[PDB]
Ligand binder design. Sequence first.
Ligand SMILES: [Mg+2]
Ligand SMILES: [Mg+2]
Ligand SMILES: [Mg+2]
Ligand SMILES: [Mg+2]
Ligand SMILES: [Mg+2]
Ligand SMILES: [Mg+2]
Ligand SMILES: [Mg+2]
Ligand SMILES: [Mg+2]
Ligand SMILES: [Mg+2]
Ligand SMILES: [Mg+2]
Ligand SMILES: [Mg+2]
Lengths: 237, 39, 257, 343, 66, 59, 103, 101, 94
Amino acid sequence: MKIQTNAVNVLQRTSAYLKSGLLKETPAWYNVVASIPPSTKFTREPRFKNPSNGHIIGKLVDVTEQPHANNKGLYKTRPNSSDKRVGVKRLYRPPKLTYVEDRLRSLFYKQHPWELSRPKILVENEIGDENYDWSHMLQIGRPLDGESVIQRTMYLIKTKQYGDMVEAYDHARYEFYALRMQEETEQQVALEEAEMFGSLFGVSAIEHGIQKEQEVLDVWEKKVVEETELMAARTSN
Amino acid sequence: MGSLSNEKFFDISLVDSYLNKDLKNISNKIDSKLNPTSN
Amino acid sequence: IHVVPKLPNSKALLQNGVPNILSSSGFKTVWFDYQRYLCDKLTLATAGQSLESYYPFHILLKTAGNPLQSNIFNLASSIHNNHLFVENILPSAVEHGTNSNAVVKTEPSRLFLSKIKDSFNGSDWEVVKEEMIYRAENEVLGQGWLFLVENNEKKLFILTSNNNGTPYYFPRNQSFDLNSAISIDEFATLKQMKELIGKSTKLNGKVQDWTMPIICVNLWDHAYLHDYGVGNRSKYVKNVLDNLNWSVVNNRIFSGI
Amino acid sequence: TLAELLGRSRIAQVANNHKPLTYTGKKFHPTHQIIETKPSTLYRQEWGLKSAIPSKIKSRYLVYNDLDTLERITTFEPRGGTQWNRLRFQEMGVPIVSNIGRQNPFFKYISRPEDESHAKLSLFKEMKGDTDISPAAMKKRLKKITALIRSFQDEFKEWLVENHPDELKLNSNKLEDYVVKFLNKKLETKTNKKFNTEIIGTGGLSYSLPGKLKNSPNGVIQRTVVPGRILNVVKENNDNKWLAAIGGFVADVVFFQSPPSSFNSMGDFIRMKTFLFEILEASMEKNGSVSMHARLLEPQNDKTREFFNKRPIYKPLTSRRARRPSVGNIQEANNLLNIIKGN
Amino acid sequence: STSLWRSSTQSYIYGEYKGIHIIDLNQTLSYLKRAAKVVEGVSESGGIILFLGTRQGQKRGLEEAA
Amino acid sequence: RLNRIMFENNIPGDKRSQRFYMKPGKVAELKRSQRHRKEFMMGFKRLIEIVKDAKRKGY
Amino acid sequence: QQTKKIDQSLSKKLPKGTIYDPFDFSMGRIHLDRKYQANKNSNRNDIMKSGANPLEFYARPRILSRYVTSTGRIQHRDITGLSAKNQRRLSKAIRRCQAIGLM
Amino acid sequence: PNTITFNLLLRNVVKNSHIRKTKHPDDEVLFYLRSMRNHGVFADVITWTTCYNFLRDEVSRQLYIVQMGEHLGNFNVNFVYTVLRNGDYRAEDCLKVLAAN
Amino acid sequence: SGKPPVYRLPPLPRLKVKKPIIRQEANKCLVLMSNLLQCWSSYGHMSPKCAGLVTELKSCTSESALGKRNNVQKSNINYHAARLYDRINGKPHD
RNA sequence: GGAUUAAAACUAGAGUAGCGAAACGGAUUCGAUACCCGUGUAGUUCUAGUAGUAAACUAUGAAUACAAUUAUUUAUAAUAUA
Ligand SMILES: [Mg+2]
Ligand SMILES: [Mg+2]
Ligand SMILES: [Mg+2]
Ligand SMILES: [Mg+2]
Ligand SMILES: [Mg+2]
Ligand SMILES: [Mg+2]
Ligand SMILES: [Mg+2]
Ligand SMILES: [Mg+2]
Ligand SMILES: [Mg+2]
Ligand SMILES: [Mg+2]
Ligand SMILES: [Mg+2]
């Protein structure tokens, strides 16, 4: 709607009241608001560089700056329509933040779908209190997820121990496999130890699932008998 | 494989090689290395 | 993050170790090394999971039922039991500061003595101590823990745990070793334990219990091997039994007021 | 700075996904990332997303696609049980055997250098990457490949004429074989290591090695017995096996030479009862599905010796003695031709 | 989400990601500092500060602040 | 099955329409009105589905 | 015992190898899949949506008959699912085929 | 009914054809493939080879076998025996063709 | 044409279902009447075999013919729509 | 200025099934110069032309430069695993 005017100008209206004499006693917020001026621009603001990738928004590459030939074999000697048209809209449209990490994340999760089955907590906790040396994927204070593989890959790329990205990704995933192997073997061995030494478990996952299946199947049973009665009745008619 | 094509349905590169003497040039080059030079 | 708690007089324990029980190096190994190892293991195990927000005791209580969560259960139990042990063997519970707290040695309370009297057919505390060491050396074939615990019947009794057991929760006491031969009475005890488990009326498969620990002693070789050596765990247990923090023990005891 | 942080934020870690939340087709592996909340945050309706999940969602797990939508709601489902399916599979503890496929993916090998298998077909596959539209998508990909190979024309010319002019002057198929090899190495060059989406290994279902034994107080375990259900009272039509529900996975169930009379008694309602199954093997398929074989266990204690019955699983191919001779007609045809002549 | 964007807030957007806009935490921090200063100023002045939140679950915070 | 075939081929309504003659303009206006009503019904179906889903998820 | 035979209308036949959840056995699953019953086999196997020109089939009554009713009427775009261009070309081809007499 | 039931019926039609004192059963065969199509049963080499037996003319049989290769892509000893039996090949002809195969 | 298009309504004064249809429960007493009369038709008037069905109908219509009434069921979609329409309609910002 | 310009009209050929101004009969009405029914002319059709008006309406003459946002469909342009 309108860029309204009175909310930001409460101070001046009250000042007019006070000077004229409408209000006898000066409000308590008067001096505070006077000392802290409100923001009163309400203007659109152009942006020139996308902060995610780093691309520059608002620059051409004129004909002089492409003296070579195009992929089709022609030399560009005159501006094209795309150049000739104005593009002010780009400056004021919020940029589309993009990361090279997303491609790797999607690739990892469509190479290992069941890794999605390992729950992930999305509530942050002091994101500014992380000190990770990504020479090693194991880090204190975070789980062993695909993000570990991604960060290891970008550490390898940044410190230039590998060339293209697939090499670093392969190395990181082959470390990930070893760590997961260790973890699962530890789980199974600890369970077998406890059962060796007499630990007793009230419920296991399989029988918990069986219980839930029974509590569903009883209702299914009653529903099927009632409906088969109904359909036999209708068929008899 | 270009002008060296042996397929039934060759392309225009073969005719280009003929009009350029490229095929004949390469052929005499290799033959001269083979029979005269014994290589 | 699970970080090792700060023990009082840490400079003293690091410089010379706990007197009459463990050397400086041995106490370093048992606490400043093993506890750090255990806590980092637990942090890496439970990172990114709901259990990261709970103390080790609550972690073991929650994870007791779940079979597959045996690593986190064992880690939490070991952390809690180790801290219990070190706390009861601390020389000074509270830092001396400007007060001469060391002038007087701790002793058991008359309430504790009466509890022993009723619990063990009116036997002497020293008799109970010798029976405790005998049981510890005869039952725990390898690593484990020794506990004097109190049940809901207001009577103390002795509990031996293999590897990493918990006095609190009875199906995970790990009291019996099934690797070797077993007896008819023990098999019946396991059977009745199983039946009591089956009586549970919740999907979590949990059974109520209130067996609380009054005294805890670690039998892991990480504590005794360096100083006492192989086969001397009996002497090590004897020594720790005679030297204890009876202020802590009495505080663990339930007063009722 | 701020964008750099957002890249590592937990919200960004979830890969972009818009696959249907309510899906009725065949399901073989998880399709969404499970998002959970601690009890403390659930009490306050905080899950880490943009919006606060309503109060009636009493479960600590969910899945979602969009943080916000035009309808001012978060597209989510208070679900997530594939974790339980994976944990049940771990309980079953039957490692996945790499049938046919060798060289377990989770391990690096030096066998790849031994790459001699009809590479031309694989290269054709790789060229035809945009398999969607034959006249448009594969056509434009083919045009790109054509431009690249036109560019690479000349080097092959010199390389062939230098290496094997004999094949040229004898016009042999070694020429096309050499084309294949040349383009093979040109595909081993840079910008070709490529990214493969194909399901590698178990896909995270389980990280297990075949060979380790399960130890129990009653001795080392020899057979794994787990509960299950029978879905269809009658075996699959045209097939000799039933289908059973075992720990979240449908398994192909074989019978011990006789279906129990419980099947005839219960009819189509057999799903009500629970049975015991022994998992013979677990294997994978290219579609990412897990195919597991089970055998039903009917207790024969105090029962008949199952006499007056046939053998259903028995190979008649126990004739390696017959295999020893050729039996390929290569020489039998010669002998029979001699007979035709009269000898 | 982008589909509900009010163009009058174009100055507070750092970008768009995962189909939703991302506010600029720097501007957020500045405005928050100013708001904190003004609320503190009224606190010294002895005025009346009213915190109003109707969405579910905000009662605890509102009561504690008040 | 016969009834379903004629209903889906709109044979009855077509027969009713062809009994009398209608001007092309009236035909066009009727066509537009019917199309609008069908479009609106589909949209209403979608909105009601959204409402049911939101109720199911607690909104 | 009681009634012992039932139809397939309300008994979910789980495919082999597919992962399942307890809810799949409920009566709700049957309602859900009958509600979301979408014929994606047609999507996979339809020649027109593949990309081929519908007008190229004007001499294939067998192919064209799969986009007409029993009586010969042409299905609306809401039913056929084809793009506007594809639908117009397909109807054009069909009507032509009718003119020539092959269909 | 399974595939076996249907193919068993075919054998009956084969008996009728072998002792043909009635109308040609080709329409009965067609009716039965319609029936099994309605039932949704999946065909098998046995059903196919039965049809091969039904076939009469050489170019037809040729098309049958080539179509087989296109779609079913699997042969068997039963089918090669069937073609050898049905082609009226001489003894040496059968010998030669099977040796080549 | 990847997927079917989505159709949007204009701003509407209200979202309302005129007559909501409810999943009414079948009534076994009328079912009994129907099956008894069908049995008479099938096996002759006053079929001796269906005397049991006659007795069941006797019992279910001894008192009020309809049977018994516990509650009358109708939907709440109108309420939920009235509550969520403004939120889900996706109108342009005011 | 110029050209095109729906119905209805008009001048010549052919054509005339169905529909239908008028006209004559049914019915309905107190009456019914109508609404309903029957027989049906001129028209409606094609070919030559004449005339240039309609709620010929988006009741909105044309062109150029600009201004904030959402949804869908359209063509073409690729990140690149797609
Ligand atoms: Mg221009
Ligand atoms: Mg003019
Ligand atoms: Mg007109
Ligand atoms: Mg005339
Ligand atoms: Mg008239
Ligand atoms: Mg004119
Ligand atoms: Mg006029
Ligand atoms: Mg006018
Ligand atoms: Mg108009
Ligand atoms: Mg105009
Ligand atoms: Mg103009």
